[PDB]
Design a protein around this motif. Structure first.
Motif, PDB file in Angstrom:
ATOM      1  N   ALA A   1      29.279  87.396  41.037  1.00 51.93           N
ATOM      2  CA  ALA A   1      27.932  86.842  41.142  1.00 51.93           C
ATOM      3  C   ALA A   1      27.066  87.716  42.036  1.00 51.93           C
ATOM      4  CB  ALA A   1      27.977  85.403  41.675  1.00 51.93           C
ATOM      5  N   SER A   2      27.696  88.375  43.009  1.00 52.84           N
ATOM      6  CA  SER A   2      26.960  89.226  43.939  1.00 52.84           C
ATOM      7  C   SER A   2      26.356  90.461  43.275  1.00 52.84           C
ATOM      8  CB  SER A   2      27.857  89.651  45.095  1.00 52.84           C
ATOM      9  OG  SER A   2      28.060  88.559  45.978  1.00 52.84           O
ATOM     10  N   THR A   3      26.814  90.786  42.067  1.00 52.55           N
ATOM     11  CA  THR A   3      26.234  91.908  41.329  1.00 52.55           C
ATOM     12  C   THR A   3      24.973  91.515  40.536  1.00 52.55           C
ATOM     13  OG1 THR A   3      27.474  91.737  39.212  1.00 52.55           O
ATOM     14  CG2 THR A   3      28.581  92.848  41.069  1.00 52.55           C
ATOM     15  N   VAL A   4      24.665  90.222  40.471  1.00 49.28           N
ATOM     16  CA  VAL A   4      23.522  89.768  39.674  1.00 49.28           C
ATOM     17  C   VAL A   4      22.207  89.860  40.442  1.00 49.28           C
ATOM     18  CG1 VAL A   4      22.449  87.812  38.505  1.00 49.28           C
ATOM     19  CG2 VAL A   4      24.928  88.177  38.303  1.00 49.28           C
ATOM     20  N   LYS A   5      21.176  90.407  39.804  1.00 55.45           N
ATOM     21  CA  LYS A   5      19.822  90.367  40.365  1.00 55.45           C
ATOM     22  C   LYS A   5      18.962  89.486  39.475  1.00 55.45           C
ATOM     23  CE  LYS A   5      15.872  93.289  41.722  1.00 55.45           C
ATOM     24  NZ  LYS A   5      15.658  92.715  43.076  1.00 55.45           N
ATOM     25  N   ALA A   6      18.310  88.490  40.059  1.00 54.32           N
ATOM     26  CA  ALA A   6      17.533  87.555  39.256  1.00 54.32           C
ATOM     27  C   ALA A   6      16.125  87.404  39.811  1.00 54.32           C
ATOM     28  CB  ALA A   6      18.226  86.204  39.181  1.00 54.32           C
ATOM     29  N   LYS A   7      15.170  87.113  38.932  1.00 54.95           N
ATOM     30  CA  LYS A   7      13.768  87.043  39.340  1.00 54.95           C
ATOM     31  C   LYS A   7      13.193  85.659  39.134  1.00 54.95           C
ATOM     32  CE  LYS A   7      12.307  88.831  34.861  1.00 54.95           C
ATOM     33  NZ  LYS A   7      12.033  87.620  34.026  1.00 54.95           N
TER      34      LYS A   7
ATOM     35  N   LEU B   1      15.068  79.135  38.497  1.00 51.01           N
ATOM     36  CA  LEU B   1      16.446  79.203  38.006  1.00 51.01           C
ATOM     37  C   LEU B   1      16.666  79.679  36.565  1.00 51.01           C
ATOM     38  CD1 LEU B   1      17.935  76.222  40.010  1.00 51.01           C
ATOM     39  CD2 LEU B   1      18.937  78.516  39.869  1.00 51.01           C
ATOM     40  N   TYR B   2      15.609  79.803  35.769  1.00 47.34           N
ATOM     41  CA  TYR B   2      15.793  80.212  34.374  1.00 47.34           C
ATOM     42  C   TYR B   2      16.537  81.547  34.254  1.00 47.34           C
ATOM     43  CZ  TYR B   2      15.030  81.221  29.463  1.00 47.34           C
ATOM     44  OH  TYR B   2      15.207  81.524  28.131  1.00 47.34           O
TER      45      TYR B   2
ATOM     46  N   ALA C   1      14.809  86.706  45.451  1.00 45.63           N
ATOM     47  CA  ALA C   1      13.693  86.660  46.386  1.00 45.63           C
ATOM     48  C   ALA C   1      13.927  85.518  47.388  1.00 45.63           C
ATOM     49  CB  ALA C   1      12.380  86.466  45.629  1.00 45.63           C
ATOM     50  N   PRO C   2      13.522  85.713  48.648  1.00 49.71           N
ATOM     51  CA  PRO C   2      13.743  84.623  49.609  1.00 49.71           C
ATOM     52  C   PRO C   2      13.096  83.309  49.166  1.00 49.71           C
ATOM     53  CG  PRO C   2      13.261  86.636  50.793  1.00 49.71           C
ATOM     54  CD  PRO C   2      13.070  86.951  49.315  1.00 49.71           C
ATOM     55  N   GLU C   3      11.942  83.375  48.516  1.00 55.36           N
ATOM     56  CA  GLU C   3      11.267  82.174  48.018  1.00 55.36           C
ATOM     57  C   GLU C   3      12.172  81.475  47.001  1.00 55.36           C
ATOM     58  OE1 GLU C   3       7.615  82.987  45.909  1.00 55.36           O
ATOM     59  OE2 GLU C   3       6.846  80.935  46.104  1.00 55.36           O
TER      60      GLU C   3
END
Ligand SMILES: CC(C)N(c1cc(C#CC(C)(C)C)sc1C(=O)O)C(=O)[C@H]1CC[C@H](C)CC1
Length: 557
Positions: free
Chosen positions: A75-81, A170-171, A241-243
């Protein structure tokens, strides 16, 4: 640690409910035994409440934490926006339940000031308050079945404003994370044909394969606060993102872990401390939690070379057999471990040594032959529920056309081709509605689809063999035949005649209609055409069709 507590207030309907199969002039052409079909209503909600309400106990060992650590590493390899408000609005189904705050799904989709302003206020409140439980509505689902009656399933969902916010936060995560964490074991990344391919290749990859399905009893109710926090801990492994981290923490504390249940009339029905069936994370959360528990259980049981295939709460395991006796013992151990993890079985699992005998996602692998006589594996299922729903849809317009979804997902099958295609194309022809787009669902997401595009869709998903399959298995033929007798569906000779008629009329229309006649109903004529690839097929944008599961997640495309 109760899954639910209840005030005694009733779960109420939001509209008139019918339980008896409605009949029109078309009904008999599909089935005669009308009393066998029913829909569930809120009248049975009390029975369901009793089934879904129980205490959970959970004993977590080193196998569990070991698997979790591995999942977190992936999961640590995932980047999400984050999604923009507009992007999230555009994922909202046109007929999604309106907000209690003065706007509806159409307003959301049109980016109306009222809707966008409210969504902004909900988002801000998520960032500023990580404590106050968010209201949800509980409803009894109206779903159609064949007898042998089930009590209504329940749906629990937050307000429209909240749902849009869930998409924003979360999408991307629920669309991307599962396949990274679970790899080839994540079921929703596959078309039906690809699922069959994975199952057969997995079966063949074992020296002596054994496999089983595992049915957890009332899975959503077995999901504990621990499980939901563990799910959040996996999401937070992502590069976010922190938000987004704050919104995810907030939605977890205030919505995913539990909250108050309000009926359609605004009365407090009680309180949930298990999985909500109608949130964006229902499918991803169930998939991760089912995979985590099953993977740890495989280790506890000492199953050899377990390969999982997971779709929400639906679980198939294929492994290296250790002998019949050893296999049966290991399966009991697996069940004991799942039980300790709070995922006890409904029906006890049983080992199978024939791939075709494993039923998962209500489906199984079967075999037929293409025009050249070669063996083709394809996905089928018992046609009883599809046909019962088809009968209802024959007489009533419904929000989701199951018949259309079933043709798409089960196009190669004996029953979808002989009955569903023939019946509904006949109806469409008569009403001149071939071009009218209709809503259906695929892996829980809503899609608007024109029936005239079916041959291209089917070719893209299943290949041209879908239009030439014959010599189905005796087991499959017998299962279909039994269903037709049960519901009182007309015989093959009748369907073949109706298909020739539908085909002839489609052909005379030219264009896409003629394509439907030629491809969908080639099986029905004496002198078969040799079917070739459809030029416009490549134009369909099917990227995003089989990426992730979204059951209960209010998603539209
Ligand atoms: C054997 C032949 C008569 N035939 C056929 C009929 C079956 C049956 C049946 C019931 C008893 C279930 C009605 S099974 C079967 C086959 O090929 O295995 C077909 O040409 C099918 C007809 C329907 C289309 C869509 C596919 C080709």
């Amino acid at each position: 640690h109760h899954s639910y507590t209840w005030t005694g207030a009733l779960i109420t309907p939001c509209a008139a409910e019918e339980s008896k199969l409605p009949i029109n002039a078309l009904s008999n052409s599909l089935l005669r035994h009308h009393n066998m079909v029913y829909a569930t209503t809120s009248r049975s909600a009390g029975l369901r409440q009793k089934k879904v309400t129980f205490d959970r106990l959970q004993v977590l060992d080193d196998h569990y934490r070991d698997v979790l650590k591995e999942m977190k590493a992936k999961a640590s390899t995932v980047k999400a926006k984050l999604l923009s408000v507009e992007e999230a609005c555009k994922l909202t189904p046109p007929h999604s339940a309106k907000s209690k705050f003065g706007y509806g799904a159409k307003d959301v989709r049109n980016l109306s000031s009222k809707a966008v302003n409210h969504i902004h206020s909900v988002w801000k409140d998520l960032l500023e308050d990580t404590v106050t439980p968010i209201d949800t509505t509980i409803m009894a689902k109206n779903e159609v079945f064949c007898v042998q009656r089930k009590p209504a399933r329940l749906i629990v969902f937050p307000d429209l404003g909240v749902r849009v916010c869930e998409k924003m936060a979360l999408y991307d995560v629920v669309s991307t994370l599962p396949q990274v964490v679970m790899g080839s074991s994540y079921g929703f990344q596959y078309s039906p044909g690809q699922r069959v391919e994975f199952l057969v290749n997995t079966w063949k990859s074992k020296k002596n394969p054994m496999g089983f399905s595992y049915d957890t009893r009332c899975f959503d109710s077995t999901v504990t606060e621990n499980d939901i926090r563990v799910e959040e801990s996996i999401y937070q492994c992502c590069d976010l993102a922190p938000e987004a981290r704050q919104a995810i923490k907030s939605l977890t504390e205030r919505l995913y872990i539990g909250g108050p249940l309000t009926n359609s009339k605004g009365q407090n029905c009680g309180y949930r401390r298990c999985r909500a069936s109608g949130v964006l994370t229902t499918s991803c959360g169930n998939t991760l939690t089912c995979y985590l528990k099953a993977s740890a259980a495989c280790r506890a049981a000492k199953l050899q070379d377990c390969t999982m295939l997971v779709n929400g709460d639906d679980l198939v395991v294929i492994c290296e057999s250790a002998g019949v006796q050893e296999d049966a013992a290991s399966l009991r151990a697996f069940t004991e471990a799942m039980t300790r993890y709070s995922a006890p079985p409904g029906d006890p699992p049983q080992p199978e040594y024939d791939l075709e005998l494993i039923t998962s996602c209500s489906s199984n692998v079967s075999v037929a032959h293409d025009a050249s006589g070669k063996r083709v594996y394809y996905l089928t299922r018992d046609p009883t529920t599809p046909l019962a729903r088809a009968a209802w849809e024959t007489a009533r317009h419904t929000p989701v056309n199951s018949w259309l979804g079933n043709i798409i997902m089960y196009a190669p099958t004996l029953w979808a081709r002989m009955i569903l295609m023939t019946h509904f194309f006949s109806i469409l022809l008569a009403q001149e509605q071939l071009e009218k787009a209709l809503d259906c669902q695929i892996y829980g997401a809503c899609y608007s689809i024109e029936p005239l595009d079916l041959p291209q869709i089917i070719e893209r998903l299943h290949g041209l063999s879908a239009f030439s399959l014959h010599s189905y298995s005796p087991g499959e033929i017998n299962r279909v035949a039994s269903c037709l007798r049960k519901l009182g569906v007309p015989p093959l000779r009748v369907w073949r005649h109706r298909a020739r008629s539908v085909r002839a009329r489609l052909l005379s229309q030219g264009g896409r209609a003629a394509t439907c006649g030629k491809y969908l109903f080639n099986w029905a004529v004496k002198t078969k055409l040799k079917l070739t690839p459809i030029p416009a097929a490549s134009q369909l944008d099917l990227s995003g069709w089989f990426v992730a599961g979204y059951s209960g997640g209010d998603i539209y495309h």
